[PDB]
C-alpha cells in the first residue's frame, strides 16, 4: 500500500508516534517519505546480504529476521515479513524499539540526510488530524 502524506500522519498519530521519545510526528512522516516514499511493500537488498523492509526500511541485519541475513540479531524479535504489511502496526512497534536506542532516529539514513535539521512539522501541516 502507498500511503498519502496526511493518511500516514493520521495513522502514525493513532499508532502513538506523536512525541514518542522526544520525536515530533513530522519526523516519522518525513522519514517514511524518504525511506520508502510511503510504500509499505518497499524492500531493498543491501551488499552485506541484509535487506531493508517496509515503510520505514527496517534492516534485516539488526532488527528483523528474514532468515537470509548473515549475522542477524533480530533485535525487534519479529519476522521481516511482518514489516511488509499494509497494516503499519509491526513497523511502528519495531521503529519504537529502534529509536529507544541512544542513536535515536539516526538509524534512518534518509531521515538523517533529508529530515534532520529541516522543518519536519511541515510534513503534518495541511492535514486533518
Amino acid at each position: 500500500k502507498v500511503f498519502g502524506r496526511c493518511e500516514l500522519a493520521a495513522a502514525m498519530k493513532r499508532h502513538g508516534l506523536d512525541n514518542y521519545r522526544g520525536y515530533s510526528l513530522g519526523n516519522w512522516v518525513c522519514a517514511a517519505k524518504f525511506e520508502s516514499n510511503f510504500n509499505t511493500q518497499a524492500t531493498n537488498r543491501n551488499t552485506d546480504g541484509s535487506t531493508d523492509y517496509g515503510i520505514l526500511q527496517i534492516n534485516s541485519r539488526w532488527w528483523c529476521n528474514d532468515g537470509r541475513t548473515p549475522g542477524s540479531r533480530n533485535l525487534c524479535n519479529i519476522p521481516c515479513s511482518a514489516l511488509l504489511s499494509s497494516d503499519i502496526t509491526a513497523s511502528v512497534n519495531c521503529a519504537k524499539k529502534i529509536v529507544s536506542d541512544g542513536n535515536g532516529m539516526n538509524a534512518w539514513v534518509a531521515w538523517r540526510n533529508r529530515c534532520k535539521g529541516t522543518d519536519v512539522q511541515a510534513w503534518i501541516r495541511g492535514c486533518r488530524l
Epitope: 498519530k13 493513532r14 499508532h15 502513538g16 508516534l17 506523536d18 512525541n19 514518542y20 521519545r21 522526544g22 539488526w62 540479531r73 533480530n74 533485535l75 524479535n77 512497534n93 519504537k96 524499539k97 529507544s100 536506542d101 541512544g102 542513536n103
Partner: antibody, heavy 113, light 107 residues
Framework: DVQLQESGPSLVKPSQTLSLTCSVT????????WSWIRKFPGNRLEYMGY???????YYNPSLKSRISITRDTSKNQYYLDLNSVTTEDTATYYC???????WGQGTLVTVSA | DIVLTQSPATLSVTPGNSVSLSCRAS??????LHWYQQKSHESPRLLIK???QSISGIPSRFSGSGSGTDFTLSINSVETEDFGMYFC?????????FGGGTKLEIK
C-alpha cells in the same frame, strides 16, 4: 527459549554499593535491550533503567546518578550497580528484557545496619 | 515525569463477573501504555502492549482500550487465577513510569 535469573547478595549495609547479576540463557545478550525494575515494600514499581544494543544506557533520574548498568558478552550476563544505598533502596529487584516478555524471578535485597 | 494514576485502588469481584481497570496519564502518551499482572511471590507478566495489542499466550478475556490520557484494562469473566495486582506502565517518555496499581480480589 530465553531464561533470566538474578543473583547477588540479599543483605547489604547502608552506604555500600549494591550489585546484582542477571544471567541470560537461550540467546545472546547482544540481541536485545536489557533492563532493571524494582518493587518497593509499598507495592510501588520503579523502572530503574536499561542498556540497549549500542551500549547506550538510560537511567531513571530518581536514582540521582547512583546507578550503572553494564554487560559482559562472554558471560552472557548484565549487571546492576547502585551506589551509596540507604534503607530506601530495600526492594525486590527484577531483570527483564526491554519488551517485557522475559522476566527474572526477582530477588529481595534488604539494606540494614 | 509522566504520572500514571490507577483506580480503583482495590476491586472485589466474584469469578464469572467482568471488570474494568482505569489508568490515566498526566499528559498524552498516545498508545504507549502497557498492562502488567503481578501475583505475590512472582515477577510481573505483560498482558497488553501499546494500549490494545494482544500478547501471545495471554487469555483472550484480557483486552485493553484507550489513547491519549485515558486507558482501561478489561477482563471478560474473571477467573480465580486472575486475582492479583494490575499495573499500567508508559513508555512514551523517559523515565518509564508505572501506575500505583489496582488490586483485584475475590468478593
Amino acid at each position: 527459549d530465553v531464561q533470566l535469573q538474578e543473583s547477588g547478595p540479599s543483605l547489604v549495609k547502608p552506604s555500600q554499593t549494591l550489585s546484582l547479576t542477571c544471567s541470560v540463557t537461550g540467546d545472546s545478550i547482544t540481541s536485545d535491550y536489557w533492563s532493571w525494575i524494582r518493587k518497593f515494600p509499598g507495592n510501588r514499581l520503579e523502572y530503574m533503567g536499561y542498556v540497549s544494543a549500542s551500549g547506550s544506557t538510560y537511567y531513571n533520574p530518581s536514582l540521582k546518578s547512583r546507578i550503572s548498568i553494564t554487560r559482559d558478552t562472554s558471560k552472557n550476563q548484565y549487571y546492576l550497580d547502585l551506589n551509596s544505598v540507604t534503607t530506601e533502596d530495600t526492594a525486590t529487584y527484577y531483570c527483564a528484557n526491554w519488551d517485557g516478555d522475559y522476566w527474572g524471578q526477582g530477588t529481595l535485597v534488604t539494606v540494614s545496619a | 515525569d509522566i504520572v500514571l494514576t490507577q483506580s480503583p485502588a482495590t476491586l472485589s469481584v466474584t469469578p464469572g463477573n467482568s471488570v474494568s481497570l482505569s489508568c490515566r496519564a498526566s499528559q498524552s502518551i498516545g498508545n504507549n501504555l502497557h498492562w502488567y499482572q503481578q501475583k505475590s511471590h512472582e515477577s510481573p507478566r505483560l498482558l497488553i502492549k501499546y494500549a490494545s495489542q494482544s500478547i501471545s499466550g495471554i487469555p483472550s478475556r484480557f483486552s485493553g482500550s484507550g489513547s491519549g490520557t485515558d486507558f482501561t484494562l478489561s477482563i471478560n469473566s474473571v477467573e480465580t487465577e486472575d486475582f492479583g495486582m494490575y499495573f499500567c506502565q508508559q513508555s512514551n517518555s523517559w523515565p518509564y513510569t508505572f501506575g500505583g496499581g489496582t488490586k483485584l480480589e475475590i468478593k
